[PDB]
């Protein structure tokens, strides 16, 4: 029972996994077993979703988060996001479920049976946290792996049937990407975009050519950087800037996952390109715009002149200007005029919403989509009663966008907390005061009084 | 060891798993009945005849929606005793008339008296000063003001809080729409004492845990303490320096620190209780007269204060017909205050 | 040493009356800017068109407010989430009408308070302290981020951020109840348990320590003089306090370990308030309180109201009245 009590390890049971910091073999077990947990959930969850799935209802009426991910890759779906073949969903679920048994096998073996430390056994697989060169080497391997993952997405998009494209001319459809964006001015231009309204930083990506192109860059950057890290040791300025310890490295990764968690939250909330509204439901901005569109269509059908209709406030009841002059929907949805979506764009001209097009060109498919999106707004209760908070029971609906944004905000937040926890602990432990103040060497007692 | 009084005293004060005491004779039966009346009512008892509501697991409510509800407004402030003139010893009818409400409120009141007598009794036997009992006067002032004085100043017990999670949420919302209770400076002082108390609880726990002396080898530091040790487990000197430099001021006296931790939440709850005594009489901080005079004469003058009264006016008109069924309110659609569209 | 080295030495000095530090280099100017703008706006700013409907709300003292009604008013619904710094406006007069001060204040304040939290880590490291006081402060900080940044992001507009004022705060709460049924949300319920429990355990601890102070003074002196700053000996008897409290409840419900007791004091309100903050930050994306409206139905199909339905009626009053000139279409969808 080597290091498996507090007396010998220094760590109580509730901090038991900290007992693993310098036991690379059992720690590899923990890590591989955990990767099996992730892969397991992905496979079991997909099969569960598929078993429950009624192909003719929207995915977003069915509490689905995984099938939508598979569909966006262009598997299983045709024009408009119509499901044409559930078999690719089945394949995805089963292959992960089977794969998780393999990882679970390796995890249990390393955790429970294999060498507790790897250093004696192997110098390639063994490691010392304080070995800066071995650390950047392992980091380099993982970077190469991630770079290959990014290129797998490019391979799907370009050579293995394309991706679902909500923006495809004539209507959403799977489309092969032949001209991915390679111009670094466009690709890296996204990273320098403001995160505020009408800009949206990288969340603004609105076409699959930029999406594919960005992953070409990212795949190459990761592979190059991974090679770089295998062949270099950290520079002196790096050495002096960081703490070099397992807990420190955990902390940096916790910060990065927290940041990524917040980014994903905003991505699923606003973006309707890599989270097609056909599969995930309308965004909050989209549903609010769709409501204004709905009533403009209705009332104009009744004979209203929607361009000249002054609302109670003096602003146009249906149509008004943005602060820079663009014609936009009126009422509260004024806030959402940055919204763009395939059912609305045909009505927008160089000056914003075009009154001529509004009066003459609104098609029944646009009326339908706007009614669907207005009535699937991502508002709903914790027990999945769809609608505003005062709604009566009847409609069992909470948008996949709300489930995904809320979950990831919670996770990202606690990951920031874990970052602070571990970053601060790693600093104290490196300097030797994580267990308390030395009563005979209390720093403040050697300091001059403040006053 | 003398007469029966002193033999009873001996037995009452035995050192056992659950201390009893003379206070236990009042406390135990009253706490037991208050809690059991609550579980019994929420599990089995309706509010159909008093409120027109279902309120029990039996009728289909969940832990959030069950309550023991107040009696009908026609009961006034009846003690509603089982043997009294309303139920006349009929247990079933007494349940249907809201008898469990006054049962719980009154046993609960005597139980809190008994708990506080328990704090004094145990303090006296162990030889400590009775500041815990003193601190508990704040829970008492809150219970008595909200559950007894408030409905005694109103028309009936009907307007006391009902004993339930959602029922209490309803009570909050009623106090906003009818009393504008958020505007009341006695409630604001309560909020300061509660949030300031939670602040003191957090910051004091975190400071002690982060200025601890290394008194063991463990990276888990809880074992490195001994109750009987002479020495402080953490450094007041280092804690004082840290807060002096971070915030500008710091505690330097541990005795003052702990007294202040009693003072803040106890004082905030006592202030909120005084505001509720005023609400018993509808003596509200509802309005600022100067705001109303200006807004009445100037239809372009708007503040968050005038926005909130519009919300109150909505709450009163929309909630009153179902919340106050004895009033038989019928408000035709055309009279309901509503803004545009909604 | 060189100029830079002396500067660094000063910035990080453990000897400054107020610690500066690298976080402080960002905190000081950002907090100063937010404070000065707030004070001036709260006294003197003209009315602000919070809801973008040309209906300006007066927040400042000179325009007819008192301390309770006054606020710095959120920026205009026409702006939405657009970044509206002073230089985006044609004039200061436009900037004021549109609620520019609100954005300036909240962005500088959030940046500064985030650096306040880093500074707490920073000084604890300079002093050889354990590092997690900054983690306790993350709870109120997360709550300020929820109401000034995350909620506006979810709803698409800083006009829905919490106003910087006492009555504006109540407005935000009441509208939030109409729109999310927050009271029925378990994360807000956990926050209530956090703050009520924080207050309860604050009073408990204060009273238990105070009750067991060791006699060191006469009856004509405050007992506080019985403790001297920096003395080595504990100033109360924890064994006495535990002996009292273990008897009040039962032995194993009481702490005799001061480290465990103080950890609990930190954790209970901090965890509860993290859930409060996550309540607001997830209702930001409209995952709302439990809805049991018409959950109870009789044999025929008649609705049998519960207390949840009465809550619903109060929520409806808030909903139909709020921003009474701002909605043109039948659903309030942000």
């Amino acid at each position: 029972a080597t290091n498996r009590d507090q007396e010998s390890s220094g760590f109580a049971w509730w901090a038991g996994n900290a007992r693993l910091i310098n036991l690379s073999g059992k720690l590899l077990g923990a890590h591989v077993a955990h990767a099996g947990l992730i892969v397991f959930w992905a496979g079991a969850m997909t099969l569960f979703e598929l078993a429950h799935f009624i192909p003719e209802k929207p995915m977003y009426e069915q509490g689905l988060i995984l099938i939508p991910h598979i569909a966006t890759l262009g598997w299983g779906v045709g024009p408009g996001g119509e499901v044409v073949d559930t078999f690719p969903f089945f394949v995805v679920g089963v292959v992960h479920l089977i794969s998780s048994a393999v990882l679970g096998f390796g995890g249990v073996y390393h955790a429970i049976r294999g060498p507790e430390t790897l250093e004696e056994y192997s110098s390639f697989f063994g490691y010392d946290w304080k070995d800066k060169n071995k650390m950047t080497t392992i980091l380099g391997f993982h970077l190469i792996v991630l770079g290959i993952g990014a290129l797998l997405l490019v391979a799907k998009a370009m050579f293995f049937g394309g991706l679902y494209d909500t923006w495809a001319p004539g209507g959403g459809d799977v489309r092969v990407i032949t001209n991915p964006t390679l111009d670094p001015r466009v690709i890296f231009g996204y990273l320098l975009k403001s995160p505020f309204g009408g800009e949206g930083w990288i969340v603004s990506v609105n076409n699959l050519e930029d999406v594919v192109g960005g992953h070409i860059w990212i795949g190459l950057i990761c592979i190059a950087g991974g090679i770089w890290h295998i062949l270099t040791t950290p520079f002196g300025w790096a050495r002096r800037a960081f703490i070099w310890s397992g807990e420190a490295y955990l902390s940096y990764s916790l910060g990065a996952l927290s940041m990524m968690g917040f980014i994903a939250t905003c991505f699923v909330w606003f973006n309707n390109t890599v989270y097609p509204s056909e599969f995930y439901g309308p965004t909050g901005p989209e549903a609010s715009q769709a409501q204004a569109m709905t009533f403009l269509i209705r009332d104009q059908k009744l004979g209203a002149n929607v361009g000249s209709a002054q609302g109670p406030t003096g602003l146009g009841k249906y149509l008004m200007r943005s602060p820079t002059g663009e014609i936009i929907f009126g009422g509260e949805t004024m806030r959402f005029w940055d919204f763009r979506g395939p059912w609305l764009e045909p009505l927008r001209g160089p000056n914003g919403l075009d009154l001529n097009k509004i009066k003459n060109d609104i098609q029944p498919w646009q009326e339908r989509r706007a009614a669907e999106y207005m009535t699937h707004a991502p508002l709903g209760s914790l027990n999945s009663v769809g609608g505003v908070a005062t709604e009566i029971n009847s409609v069992n609906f909470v948008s996949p966008r709300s489930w995904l944004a809320t979950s990831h905000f919670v996770l990202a937040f606690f990951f920031l907390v874990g970052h602070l926890w571990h970053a601060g602990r790693a600093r104290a432990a490196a300097a030797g005061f994580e267990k308390g103040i030395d009563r005979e060497s209390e720093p403040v007692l050697s300091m001059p009084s403040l006053d | 060891e003398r007469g029966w009084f002193d033999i009873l005293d001996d037995w009452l004060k035995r050192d056992r798993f659950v201390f009893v005491g003379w206070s236990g004779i009042l406390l135990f039966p009253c706490a037991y009945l208050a809690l059991g009346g609550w579980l019994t009512g929420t599990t089995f008892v309706t509010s159909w005849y008093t409120h027109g509501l279902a309120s029990s697991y039996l009728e289909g409510c969940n832990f959030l929606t069950v309550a023991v509800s107040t009696p009908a407004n026609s009961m006034g402030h009846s003690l509603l005793l089982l043997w009294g003139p309303e139920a006349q010893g009929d247990f079933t009818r007494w349940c249907q008339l809201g008898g469990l409400w006054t049962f719980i409120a009154l046993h609960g009141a005597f139980g809190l008296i008994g708990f506080m007598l328990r704090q004094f009794e145990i303090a006296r036997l162990v030889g400590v000063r009775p500041y815990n009992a003193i601190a508990f006067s704040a829970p008492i002032a809150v219970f008595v003001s909200v559950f007894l004085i408030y409905p005694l100043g109103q028309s009936s017990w009907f307007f006391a809080p009902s004993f339930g999670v959602a029922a209490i949420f309803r009570f909050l919302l009623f106090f906003q729409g009818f009393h504008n209770w958020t505007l009341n400076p006695f409630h604001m002082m309560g909020v300061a004492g509660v949030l300031g108390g939670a602040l003191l609880c957090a910051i004091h726990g975190a400071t002690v845990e982060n200025t601890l002396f290394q008194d063991g080898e463990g990276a888990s530091t809880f074992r490195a303490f001994n109750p009987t040790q002479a020495e402080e487990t953490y450094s007041m000197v280092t804690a004082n320096r840290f807060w002096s430099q971070i915030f500008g001021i710091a505690f330097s006296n541990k005795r003052w620190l702990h007294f202040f931790m009693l003072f803040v939440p106890v004082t905030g709850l006592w202030m909120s209780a005084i505001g509720v005594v005023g609400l018993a009489l509808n003596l509200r901080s509802y309005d600022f007269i100067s705001q109303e005079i200006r807004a009445a004469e100037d239809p372009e003058f708007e503040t968050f204060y005038t926005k909130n009264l519009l919300l109150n006016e909505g709450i009163r008109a929309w909630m009153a017909p179902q919340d106050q069924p004895h009033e038989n309110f019928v408000f035709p659609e055309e009279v309901l205050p509503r803004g545009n569209a909604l | 040493a060189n100029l830079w080295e002396r500067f660094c030495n000063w910035v990080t000095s453990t000897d400054n009356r107020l610690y500066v530090g690298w976080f402080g280099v960002i905190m000081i100017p950002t907090l100063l800017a937010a404070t000065i703008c707030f004070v001036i706006a709260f006294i003197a700013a003209p009315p602000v068109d919070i809801d973008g409907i040309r209906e300006p709300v007066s927040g400042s003292l000179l325009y007819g407010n008192n301390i309770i009604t006054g606020a710095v008013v959120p920026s205009s619904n026409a702006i939405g989430l657009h970044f509206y710094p002073i230089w985006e406006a044609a004039s200061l007069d436009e900037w004021l009408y549109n609620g520019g001060p609100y954005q300036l204040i909240i962005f500088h304040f959030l940046l500064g308070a985030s650096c306040y939290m880093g500074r707490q880590w920073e000084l604890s490291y300079r002093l050889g302290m354990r590092p997690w006081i900054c983690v306790a402060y993350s709870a109120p900080l997360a709550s300020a981020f929820a109401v000034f940044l995350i909620y506006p992001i979810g709803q698409g507009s800083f006009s829905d951020g919490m106003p910087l004022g006492i009555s504006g705060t109540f407005n935000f709460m009441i509208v939030f109840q109409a729109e999310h049924n927050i009271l029925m949300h378990p994360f807000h319920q956990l926050g209530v348990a956090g703050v009520f429990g924080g207050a309860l355990f604050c009073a408990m601890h204060g009273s238990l320590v105070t009750s067991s102070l060791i006699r060191e003074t006469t009856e004509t002196e405050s007992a506080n003089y019985g403790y001297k700053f920096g003395q080595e000996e504990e100033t109360y008897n924890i064994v006495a306090a535990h002996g009292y409290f273990g008897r009040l409840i039962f032995q194993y419900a009481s702490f005799n370990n001061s480290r465990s007791l103080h950890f609990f004091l930190a954790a209970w309100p901090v965890v509860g308030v993290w859930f409060a903050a996550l309540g607001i930050s997830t209702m930001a994306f409209n995952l709302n309180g439990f809805n049991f409206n018409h959950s109870v139905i009789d044999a025929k199909g008649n609705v049998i109201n519960t207390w949840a339905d009465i809550i619903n009626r109060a929520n409806l009053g808030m909903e139909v009245m709020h921003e009474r000139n701002a909605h043109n279409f039948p659903l309030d969808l942000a």
């Binding site: 007692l445 009084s449 403040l450 006053d451 | 000197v237 004082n240 002096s244 500008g248 001021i249 710091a250 330097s252 | 009356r17 107020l18 006294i43 003292l61 000179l62 008192n66 301390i67 700053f229 920096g230």
Partner: peptide, 29 residues
């Protein structure tokens, strides 16, 4: 007169903060 009163009390409190910090009774070990 009311605005003057509110701003005056506020200014007194900011002054009070300055003295309570920089002219506190110094803590003595």
């Amino acid at each position: 007169m009311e605005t003057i009163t509110y701003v005056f009390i506020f200014a007194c409190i900011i002054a009070l903060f300055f003295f309570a910090i920089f002219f506190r009774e110094p803590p003595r070990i």
